[PDB]
Each structure stands twice: as C-alpha cells, then as structure tokens.
Write a protein that binds this ligand. Sequence first.
Ligand SMILES: N[C@@H](CC(=O)O)C(=O)O
Ligand SMILES: N[C@@H](CC(=O)O)C(=O)O
Ligand SMILES: [Cl-]
Ligand SMILES: [Cl-]
Ligand SMILES: [Li+]
Ligand SMILES: [Li+]
Lengths: 262, 262
Amino acid sequence: GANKTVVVTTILESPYVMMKKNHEMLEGNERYEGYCVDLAAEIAKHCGFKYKLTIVGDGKYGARDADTKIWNGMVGELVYGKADIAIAPLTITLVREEVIDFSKPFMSLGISIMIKKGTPIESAEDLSKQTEIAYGTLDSGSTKEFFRRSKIAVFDKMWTYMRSAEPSVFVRTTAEGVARVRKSKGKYAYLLESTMNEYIEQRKPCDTMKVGGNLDSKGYGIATPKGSSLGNAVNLAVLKLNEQGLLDKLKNKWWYDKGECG
Amino acid sequence: GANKTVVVTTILESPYVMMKKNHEMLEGNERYEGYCVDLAAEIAKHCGFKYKLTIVGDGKYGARDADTKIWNGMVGELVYGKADIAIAPLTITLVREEVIDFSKPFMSLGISIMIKKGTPIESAEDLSKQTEIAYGTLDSGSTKEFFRRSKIAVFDKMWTYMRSAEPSVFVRTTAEGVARVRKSKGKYAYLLESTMNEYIEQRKPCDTMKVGGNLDSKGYGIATPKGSSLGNAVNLAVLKLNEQGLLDKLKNKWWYDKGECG
Ligand SMILES: N[C@@H](CC(=O)O)C(=O)O
Ligand SMILES: N[C@@H](CC(=O)O)C(=O)O
Ligand SMILES: [Cl-]
Ligand SMILES: [Cl-]
Ligand SMILES: [Li+]
Ligand SMILES: [Li+]
C-alpha cells in the first residue's frame, strides 16, 4: 500500500497547460505552465500525493469509437489504466460520467462562437441560416457531440450542415481552429468553449472575438478511473479551493493578467 | 425491496417552489409550482420513482450548530433520515458534501448584491467602505457561511461589520430580505444568490436590481443521504436533462417568461 507517484494525464491547451518557451532546458513537471499546472500542484498538496504530468499521447479530449467502442484521448488514458487522474479542461458529460469519475466542477463554461473581427455573424441562428461563412468544431470532444446529438432545431440544422460540409469544417486541435479563423478572412467561424474563446480574444494579434451568448452551460471536472479511491479527496480539494478563492485567483492569473490586447 | 414513494424535501423559494394561489383547493404535489417542481417530475420520470413533495419544516437550507453539532434545514432532513432526496436550490459546499451526496450541479450561481433602485452602491467594495447603507444575508445557508469563513480582505471586512451590526442585518428568509430592501428607502442592501436576485428584478413592483459582478461561482445540486443508492441515477438524470436542453427550457420558463417588468 506504498505511496505511488500519481500519473496525471493532461492536454496542451492554452492557458491550461502550455510548454514553457525554454522547455528543452527543463525536466519533468517544470517543462509546463498554466492554470491546470497550478491547479495540479494545489490538488496534490491538499490530497497528499506526488505526481508526474504527462501529455495525452493522441492530443485528444476523449470520445468512443462507434464500432470498436474504444475510447481515445484523456478519457481513454483513464479507462485503460494508463493514468491515475486527468487534470485538464475536461468537460463533464453523461457519456463520460458513465465510464470515469468526476469531481464537482472547477470551472464553468459553454459552447460559444469565435469569429474574425468584422465577420457579420452575431448568433448561432445567424450561422445556421447561411453557408458563405463556413463553421465547425474540434474533433473527439464534447462540442462536436453536442451538435451531433442535439434535437434543438437551430443546432440540428448546424450539425446537418457541418457533417456534410466540404472541405471538412472539423479540426484536430483548438490551435488549428483558431488558425483557420485567423487565415480565412472572415469565411470561417469556430465553435469552441467560452473559456478558450475568452482567452484567445485577449492574445495578440487580437483579431478574434467571442460573439453572442453561450449555447449551453456545463463544467470541467477533475477525472479519475471509475471507483478510484483518489476521487473523494480530489473532490473535497476542488470544493475547498473554490471556497478559499484559489480558483478565482488562478482564473485572473491566466486570463486577465495574461491580457495582451490592452 | 419494494418500490417506496420517495420523500422529497424542498423549500418555498421563488421561482423554485411556490404555493399556487389556489393551493387550498388542491392536494399533494399539485399544491406547488416552480422550477424545482418541474425538475422533480423530470428526475422522477428518468429514475423511475414516485414521490411526495414536502416543505422543510423549519424553512431553512441547512447549517450545523457549532455546539450541538445538529444540522437544521433540508440538510438536516437528509442527515437524520426524514427525507430521501432534496430537490431545491441547495448550494454545493465543502461542509455539506462531507455529510450528504450531491449530483453534479443543475444550475450555476454566485453571491450577488440586491439594491433598491437608485441606491449609490455598485460593488462589494463600495458596501465595505461605508455604513450608512446597512447590508446583510440569509441565516442558515451558504451565503452567510461564505462571509464568515472568508479570508479575502473585502469580504472579511464585510463580515466584521455584519456580525456586530445593530439592529441585526440577518434575515430568516429571502422574502424577508427583499421586503427589507424594498421598505428601507435605499438604506439596506441584501446579499443573495444571483439566481434569486435576477428573478426578483423582473417581478413587480420592479424596484430592485442586481448590481456589480458575482462575488463567487458555485452550483446547486440535487442531494441525497450519504451512500444512498438513488444518487447514481439522479446524477445521470441531471446530466441527461442538461444535455437535452431541458434545464435551459425550465430556466426560460420560470425566469424570463415570468418577467413582469417588461
Ligand atoms: N473541453 C472539451 C473540448 C471541446 O470539445 O470543446 C472536451 O472535454 O471534450
Ligand atoms: N442556496 C443557499 C441559500 C443562501 O445562503 O443563499 C443555500 O443552499 O444555503
Ligand atoms: Cl467558473
Ligand atoms: Cl446555469
Ligand atoms: Li446547462
Ligand atoms: Li468559483
């Protein structure tokens, strides 16, 4: 029953986990910085464990293949026994809750629209009623699944377009989506979680923005393999850190103190 | 192992649970209406149980006495075996999570400031720096505990004032707090959760408003006695109802379709 170093799976997603510019000079956990790097240190301190940060091998959040039923991404790392905990912007969803355990949420968010500044779109309804401006989502995460499973008219219409659009409107990483918005001269809009959208709006070159309200409301949770004894302590730590204002401090540190757009 | 009617504890708090105007003509669950009445019906349908709504006897959310260590309110009803589930705007907190089980949250909120229109206050900092305008909170809930336990300078200053203020700035129910704001000619401001503040701002006589940002961020959860077998199904139902847009529909029904202030 010896104490064992906890293997943490996480994902390179700004400002949650980022490679320090000089990462090749550094070793181990010191290579990384961000909101989730700081949160991992706090959770570990409050739960009394030592840990090793690892970046998910496939760069994905996690989805299940319809035919093989195999989970990929961080969810897969937990499900198949490769990691002990995921500390990442991992959205709590019904399908995931059935296969992994989640803390109460450490951050709230909703799906939102990113545009290149000046794009004549203000809402999901606006996007759904036109095709000149292409729009899409990240693969292998909760946002794509939201559209695929929606029975709400506007979102069904959006999914109906996205699933058949040529060329593909889907991207492998948030960075790819943002690059496509920036390089498409207003002819691509990107659907992504409000947290990431709000961060990117305050980073140079300051050419994107969030428009409209959020399309839904949900949260990120710290995930553990189903039935793991670590889950109880981690959940209490999230609640304690929230109540002591630490999560709000980290939000301010990594979003608004990081603002470059004045 | 016979199916047993589930006893639901809840609280009279608008627009979550309200007595219908003609309640004396009605019996049982039909006496009540509101967001949590609708949510209870949906949760029960998705979990396959029958239920009886009961209003918490002491009219309280739930706190533990420092000396006797006895829990009151809805929390007490669960802890001492008087109810099987609480379906109410019951805030998920560390101290409660240790004694009862909670679903993932069904609604997000934060502590907020209610003023009578025209009161010269825009922030918690503003309140903390003066005493002409008295301010307080509800007894026996999470908002009072937030201030009592805060180590954040502005909130500690506020608690330092509130705890010794004469006459008392604390109230037994939200309705009492709102009445005091309305009747105090701008000389009382009330600290309460944003959800309730936003509802009341859209009800006649349309003389109150929310000012400033929220002071914190947290959620309401459906609560069960610790270890209850019902908790798993209830949690999945909350997630499913969120994902299918039902919670958003209920929010719109009970807040904005209920708007009387045009
Ligand atoms: N945070 C999301 C990523 C997305 O799909 O927007 C997830 O957990 O899958
Ligand atoms: N909803 C809160 C009430 C409050 O204190 O504002 C609770 O659960 O205690
Ligand atoms: Cl948040
Ligand atoms: Cl919400
Ligand atoms: Li939601
Ligand atoms: Li928070």
